[PDB]
Design a protein around this motif. Structure first.
Motif, short mmCIF file in Angstrom:
data_model
loop_
_atom_site.label_atom_id
_atom_site.label_comp_id
_atom_site.label_asym_id
_atom_site.label_seq_id
_atom_site.Cartn_x
_atom_site.Cartn_y
_atom_site.Cartn_z
N UNK E 1 30.38 57.31 34.63
CA UNK E 1 29.47 56.20 34.91
C UNK E 1 28.41 56.07 33.83
N UNK E 3 24.87 56.25 33.40
CA UNK E 3 23.55 56.67 33.84
C UNK E 3 22.77 57.07 32.61
N UNK E 98 12.65 33.23 23.33
CA UNK E 98 12.30 32.02 24.07
C UNK E 98 13.59 31.43 24.61
N UNK E 99 13.73 31.38 25.93
CA UNK E 99 14.98 30.93 26.53
C UNK E 99 15.14 29.42 26.39
N UNK E 100 16.32 28.98 25.95
CA UNK E 100 16.59 27.57 25.68
C UNK E 100 17.82 27.12 26.46
N UNK E 101 17.84 27.44 27.74
CA UNK E 101 18.83 26.87 28.63
C UNK E 101 20.22 27.47 28.55
N UNK E 102 21.22 26.62 28.31
CA UNK E 102 22.62 27.03 28.31
C UNK E 102 23.31 26.29 27.17
N UNK E 114 12.61 34.73 17.22
CA UNK E 114 11.72 34.34 16.14
C UNK E 114 10.84 35.51 15.75
N UNK E 116 6.77 36.33 14.83
CA UNK E 116 5.52 35.79 15.34
C UNK E 116 4.87 34.82 14.36
N UNK E 118 4.97 31.68 11.99
CA UNK E 118 5.43 30.45 11.36
C UNK E 118 4.29 29.53 10.97
#
Ligand code: MG
Ligand code: MG
Ligand code: MG
Ligand code: MG
Ligand code: MG
Ligand code: MG
Ligand code: MG
Ligand code: MG
Ligand code: MG
Ligand code: MG
Ligand code: MG
Ligand code: MG
Ligand code: MG
Ligand code: MG
Ligand code: MG
Ligand code: MG
Ligand code: MG
Ligand code: MG
Ligand code: MG
Ligand code: MG
Ligand code: MG
Ligand code: MG
Ligand code: MG
Ligand code: MG
Ligand code: MG
Ligand code: MG
Ligand code: MG
Ligand code: MG
Ligand code: MG
Ligand code: MG
Ligand code: MG
Ligand code: MG
Ligand code: MG
Ligand code: MG
Ligand code: MG
Ligand code: MG
Ligand code: MG
Ligand code: MG
Ligand code: MG
Ligand code: MG
Ligand code: MG
Ligand code: MG
Ligand code: MG
Ligand code: MG
Ligand code: MG
Ligand code: MG
Ligand code: MG
Ligand code: MG
Ligand code: MG
Ligand code: MG
Ligand code: MG
Ligand code: MG
Ligand code: MG
Ligand code: MG
Ligand code: MG
Ligand code: MG
Ligand code: MG
Ligand code: MG
Ligand code: MG
Ligand code: MG
Ligand code: MG
Ligand code: MG
Ligand code: MG
Ligand code: MG
Ligand code: MG
Ligand code: MG
Ligand code: MG
Ligand code: MG
Ligand code: MG
Ligand code: MG
Ligand code: MG
Ligand code: MG
Ligand code: MG
Ligand code: MG
Ligand code: MG
Ligand code: MG
Ligand code: MG
Ligand code: MG
Ligand code: MG
Ligand code: MG
Ligand code: MG
Ligand code: MG
Ligand code: MG
Lengths: 114, 209, 123, 54, 119
Positions: E1, E3, E98-102, E114, E116, E118
């Motif tokens: 397993x 663990x 940064x979540x951008x959907x699907x 990214x 930090x 820009x």
RNA sequence: AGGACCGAACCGACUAAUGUUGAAAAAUUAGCGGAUGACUUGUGGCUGGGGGUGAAAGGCCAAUCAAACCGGGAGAUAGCU
RNA sequence: ACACAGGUGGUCAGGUAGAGAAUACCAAGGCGCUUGAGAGAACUCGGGUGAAGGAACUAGGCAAAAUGGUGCCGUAACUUC
RNA sequence: AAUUCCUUGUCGGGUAAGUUCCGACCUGCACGAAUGGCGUAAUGAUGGCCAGGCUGUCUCCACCCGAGACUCAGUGAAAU
RNA sequence: CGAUGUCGGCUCAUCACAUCCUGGGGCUGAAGUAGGUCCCAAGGGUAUGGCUGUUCGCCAUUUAAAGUGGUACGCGAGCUGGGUUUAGAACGUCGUGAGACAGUUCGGUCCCUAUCUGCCGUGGGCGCUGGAGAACUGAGGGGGGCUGCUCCUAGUACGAGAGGACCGGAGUGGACGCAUCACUGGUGUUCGGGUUGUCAUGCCAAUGGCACUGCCCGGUAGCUAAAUGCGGAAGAGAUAAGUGCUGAAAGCAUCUAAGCACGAAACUUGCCCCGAGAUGAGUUCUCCCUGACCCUUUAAGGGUCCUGAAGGAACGUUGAAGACGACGACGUUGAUAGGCCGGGUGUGUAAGCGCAGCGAUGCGUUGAGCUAACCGGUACUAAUGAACCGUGAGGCUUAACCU
């Protein structure tokens, strides 16, 4: 944990010398029999050292009487009294297990100067 | 007798004057404290309910904090209950010291197990596996046959097969206590008490020694 | 840790130098024997003339295991040859009179106080 | 691995009972551009909690 | 397993799971933000940022060590000239997810990884 | 010199694991045998159902064999379901 | 019968090793094989490693492990030399 | 014996133990001389047996990396 | 017969008791030891090999014991195909022949994703009649029970000697199980090194790719057993065979009719586990809601508005929890993971420079460099203000204190 390492510095000893792999070690083990408790030597190359603080160990190997004997120890244990180095050598490994199948003239370790 | 609650932190070894390497483990036990005293007329049985540890203020809930301030204790983390016998005098406000085990030779330890997942038939119940060779096809680890033919013609109840491995309450008994710690609140017991480290176990005097 | 079909060297002077275990004794379904046990062996390769010939069946005792013995302090003692000492079916005490090699300390008891006098190194 | 009867619409629905897809429970709103993006996700515009990333 | 373990298998073998992360870490330091899926960008984290913690302390030998890590003569010079001193005060954490959907053809839950810096 | 030897192309198919509404209505992967000879192979022509061909197993003759495939007598006959 | 891990005769023959059209990496040249993204269970296919013993396994050393090239010294009964 | 039923015939090696193997006996139920006798160097993807080397075949199975099986997205069968 | 696969092995059992072991009692042609033979007792345990296709059998060797049977002579939608069994071939023998023969050697394709009953696990809805957070009482159930040997008593009794105990105590081992990894090791294609062959990074050095991690040597945490801790109990109750006490029927003997006492691994308990979906739906200390109304459903009824709290679900960080669910910790008041500094641990003097030398190479800085999960640390990155669901004194009857 500092609940482990508070009692893992009470059981330890401060009288352990320093050694590398590939050298001959004299070890005086205490032995009980009957009522007498007396010393008994041990002398051979050491081929495996394990460093775990309280749980540290090493392995001594000698061809006593033809029957080759390996014996591990417990470094910070009260069954070992004293440990001395006798002749320190220079191997470029630290797990000498090729000194298991090898006997006689060709199973040497050369001397270390300085 | 009056149990206590500890947390297993690690495993180490105590040596002797001789050279015995006694295996031992450290269950930290803080001073537990009485929370709810029952008896027959109040609830139906004489017992004691306690709690030790520490829990945050913004995640102790309004049902629990009322029960806390009804007693006058800190914000502990559990709620455990110990059955009892007669011949005792007790209150609620007094906290139980860690030295109740300071005169008992053999103790008992209960706790949870470890979680070994959905196990196998060769792994849990120790079924000896079959030939990995010599003609045998696609049946190296299966549990083989399970019932008779047509009388019963069904798989009996009480059979053992695959499932969840452990992960429940188990019990080891009569163990060896070697040393207590008034300074850093420990119990040193010989062996391998159940559960992984980071779990809370229920320790007591041994029921039969 | 000697099971059946284990080919042992012979420690003593009693002519054999290669034996083969056939049973372990002292309890049903037993698998392993270390020091202090009484296995039953045949004899596969003697010397030209000795006290026991080829094909005898007689008890023995394992005295030197490659798996090693385990002390109280956790320390192990390991050897480099699985080897035994011959015995006698009606006396439980040996046939030869000289024991080569070292034997272990954990064998001494008044069933076996005769292999701790001849052995040159009670380890 | 061969059936022996043809079961019914009742058993078919009784199996199909537990297919209960629920939608998103609620969305959530920005504080400088103001749309209903997903909770813990960027907007289609490219906003997340004040920042305009790209 | 499984663990107490670490790492992630990511349905590729281990001649693949270093040869992919070479290209991903050869693109992230190039363009400072990219769009890739969430398990491939939660564990690209500790493949790119110890490569920058090493590059904080300039030497000669680290220009061979990161050359072993990357095998790109462009990226070793840029990693030791620009992206070295620009984060010479933090105790790590040179990334941000940064979540951008699907995603369209496979429903792949993507993310934007990214640095930090820009602005 | 070889109806010689070890061995790739090429030809064949001994054992085991896969798979037997599979990638294939007989194959694939690790191993095997022959491998200048009684060999292997591209092209064309010859033989024909009681007959052809057979280093012989009733084998093979268009994924069909102790008498092929198609049409006709034929809606053959059936004490049997 | 499938945009089928099947089959089908000839022509050309680069490097560094290499006896060589074997083999391992390559250039000239071509493709990533028309579903994916995840979690890291029982079990199964294909595989690498293993303490003590070494065929007790089983119908059977089936499978697996092992040997493995060039040069030199050497080489038994038996025989149709 | 590839032919032998009474049979695991009888003896000796091989094994601690050997209904198979190799060597002799002959009381061959029912071998036998071109539907051939007995013998034999080499050879066989051949039948049977023991020995050294080698190890998960096994006592006793533990871990590891990959293609499936479990979850989410698109296409979507079959036996009965 | 428009088909239920057949012997033996492998893997899993369960019951029967005409009981192999172990438990308790009576008889003996039973001194002790060991046995003979029936009577009660089925909780638990029951050999690894040689040989043939074989259950058996014979043989070698242990143990307390190597029980006897049914279950389609258990079990091929679980597994070998050696036996008898298809097509080929041969020997004996039979027939003139085609071919046969519980006579024999030799080679001979074992198909299937589980719909339903069943069984081991994990779960959502609702009920438990105000709704939510927990801890529990336990009617029932379910695993568990084994045995060897040495030592004390004691070389006592018994016995002529030879031998050699009952009854109670102390220790150590095997088979079977429960856990855990500190010690001994195993794996450790994610951590160091050596090394071949080849092509590239312009090149020398230096590193990386590919050939089963190319071949190896080592190896952290975890997973594991051969590694070491624990268990089988002791006690209580009524009991089976049997021995009793008192005592008539039958003035006497009589365990029996009245009654009273003993009695074993079987029985109920005692040890332990999931255990209120126990509908006979529980016990139990806590925290929250004390607003207005009109409509015919005339009250357990439908709707408009401030009300939406206790608490849970969903979302993100995830774990010594895990197939997916579920269980557990953290959510800017905070260390839940990834990062980072100091350490540890593993490998074994990195590159670069100067010396030595024909050069392979050594020597110095140097136990240096790199470091997976690992123990104690740091807000640099990621965990969002909210929104969503759950409501406003709990139905009726009957009894009891009280204003
Ligand atoms: Mg777990
Ligand atoms: Mg087996
Ligand atoms: Mg198959
Ligand atoms: Mg297989
Ligand atoms: Mg039917
Ligand atoms: Mg982790
Ligand atoms: Mg052919
Ligand atoms: Mg064939
Ligand atoms: Mg092939
Ligand atoms: Mg050839
Ligand atoms: Mg040839
Ligand atoms: Mg015809
Ligand atoms: Mg045909
Ligand atoms: Mg005809
Ligand atoms: Mg007509
Ligand atoms: Mg008709
Ligand atoms: Mg008609
Ligand atoms: Mg295609
Ligand atoms: Mg494809
Ligand atoms: Mg995929
Ligand atoms: Mg897996
Ligand atoms: Mg291997
Ligand atoms: Mg091994
Ligand atoms: Mg090894
Ligand atoms: Mg055998
Ligand atoms: Mg083979
Ligand atoms: Mg091989
Ligand atoms: Mg014969
Ligand atoms: Mg005959
Ligand atoms: Mg016969
Ligand atoms: Mg014989
Ligand atoms: Mg003969
Ligand atoms: Mg003849
Ligand atoms: Mg003739
Ligand atoms: Mg041939
Ligand atoms: Mg044999
Ligand atoms: Mg595939
Ligand atoms: Mg699938
Ligand atoms: Mg789907
Ligand atoms: Mg039918
Ligand atoms: Mg029939
Ligand atoms: Mg009876
Ligand atoms: Mg009797
Ligand atoms: Mg029973
Ligand atoms: Mg029984
Ligand atoms: Mg009982
Ligand atoms: Mg056997
Ligand atoms: Mg045999
Ligand atoms: Mg038998
Ligand atoms: Mg029957
Ligand atoms: Mg019957
Ligand atoms: Mg039977
Ligand atoms: Mg049957
Ligand atoms: Mg069946
Ligand atoms: Mg069967
Ligand atoms: Mg057959
Ligand atoms: Mg289904
Ligand atoms: Mg189902
Ligand atoms: Mg539920
Ligand atoms: Mg019960
Ligand atoms: Mg360990
Ligand atoms: Mg540790
Ligand atoms: Mg390794
Ligand atoms: Mg190279
Ligand atoms: Mg170079
Ligand atoms: Mg390449
Ligand atoms: Mg590769
Ligand atoms: Mg190691
Ligand atoms: Mg480890
Ligand atoms: Mg009683
Ligand atoms: Mg009377
Ligand atoms: Mg009487
Ligand atoms: Mg008992
Ligand atoms: Mg009892
Ligand atoms: Mg903190
Ligand atoms: Mg951190
Ligand atoms: Mg550090
Ligand atoms: Mg080191
Ligand atoms: Mg290096
Ligand atoms: Mg250097
Ligand atoms: Mg130096
Ligand atoms: Mg270093
Ligand atoms: Mg930490």
């Amino acid at each position: 944990s500092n609940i482990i390492k508070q009692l893992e510095q009470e059981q330890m000893k401060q009288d352990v010398p320093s050694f590398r792999p590939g050298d001959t070690v004299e070890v005086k083990v205490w032995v009980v029999e009957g009522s007498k408790k007396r010393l008994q030597a041990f002398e051979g190359v050491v081929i495996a050292i394990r460093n775990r603080g309280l749980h540290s160990a090493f392995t001594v190997r000698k061809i006593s009487n033809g029957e080759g004997v390996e014996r591990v120890f417990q470094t910070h244990s009260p069954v070992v009294d004293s440990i001395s180095v006798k002749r320190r050598g220079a191997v470029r490994k630290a797990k000498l297990y090729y000194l298991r199948e090898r006997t006689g003239k060709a199973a040497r370790i050369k001397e270390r100067l300085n | 007798m009056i149990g206590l609650v500890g947390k297993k932190v690690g495993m180490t070894r105590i040596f002797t004057e001789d050279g015995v390497s006694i295996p031992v483990t450290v269950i930290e036990v803080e001073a537990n404290r009485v929370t709810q005293v029952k008896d027959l007329a109040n609830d139906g049985y004489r017992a004691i309910q306690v709690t030790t540890g520490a829990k945050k203020a913004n995640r102790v809930t309004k049902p629990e904090a009322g029960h806390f301030a009804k007693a006058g204790v800190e914000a502990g983390r559990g709620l455990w209950e110990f059955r009892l016998a007669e011949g005792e005098e007790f209150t609620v406000g007094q906290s139980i010291s860690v030295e109740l085990f300071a005169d008992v030779k053999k103790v008992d330890v209960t706790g949870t197990s470890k979680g070994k997942g959905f196990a196998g038939t060769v792994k849990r119940w120790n079924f000896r596996t079959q030939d990995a060779t010599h003609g045998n096809s696609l049946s190296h680890r299966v549990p083989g046959s399970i019932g008779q033919n047509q009388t019963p013609g069904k798989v009996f109840k009480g059979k053992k097969m695959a499932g969840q491995m452990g992960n429940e309450r188990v019990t080891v008994q009569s163990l060896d206590v070697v040393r207590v710690d008034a300074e850093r609140n420990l119990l040193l017991v010989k062996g391998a008490v159940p559960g992984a480290t980071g779990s809370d176990l229920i320790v007591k005097p041994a029921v039969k020694a | 840790m000697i099971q059946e079909q284990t080919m042992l060297n012979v420690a003593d002077n009693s002519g054999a130098r290669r034996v083969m275990c056939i049973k372990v004794l002292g309890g049903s379904h037993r698998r392993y024997a270390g020091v202090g046990d009484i296995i039953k062996i045949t004899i596969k390769e003697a010397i030209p003339r000795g006290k026991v010939k080829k094909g005898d069946v007689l008890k023995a005792v394992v005295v030197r295991t490659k798996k090693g013995v385990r002390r109280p302090d956790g320390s192990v003692i390991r050897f480099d040859g699985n080897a035994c000492v011959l015995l006698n079916n009606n006396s439980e005490q040996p046939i030869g009179t000289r024991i080569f090699g070292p034997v272990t300390r954990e064998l001494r008891s008044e069933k076996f106080m005769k292999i701790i006098s001849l052995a040159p190194e009670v380890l | 691995a061969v059936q022996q009867n043809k079961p019914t619409r009742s058993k078919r629905g009784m199996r199909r009972s537990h297919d209960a897809l629920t939608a998103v429970t609620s969305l959530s709103v920005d504080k400088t551009s103001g749309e209903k993006h997903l909770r813990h996700h960027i907007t289609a515009d490219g906003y997340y909690r004040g920042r305009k990333v790209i | 397993m499984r663990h107490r373990k670490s790492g992630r298998q990511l349905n590729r073998n281990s001649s693949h799971r270093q040869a992919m992360f070479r290209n991903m870490a050869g693109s992230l330091v190039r363009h400072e933000i990219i769009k890739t899926t969430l398990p491939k960008a939660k564990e690209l984290r500790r493949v790119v940022e110890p490569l920058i913690t090493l590059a904080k302390t300039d030497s000669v030998a680290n220009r061979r060590l990161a050359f072993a890590r990357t095998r790109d003569n462009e990226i070793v010079a840029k990693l030791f000239n620009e992206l070295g001193p620009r984060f010479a005060s933090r105790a790590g954490g040179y990334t941000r997810i940064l979540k951008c959907g699907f995603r369209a053809g496979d429903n792949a839950p993507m993310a934007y990884i990214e640095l930090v810096d820009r602005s």
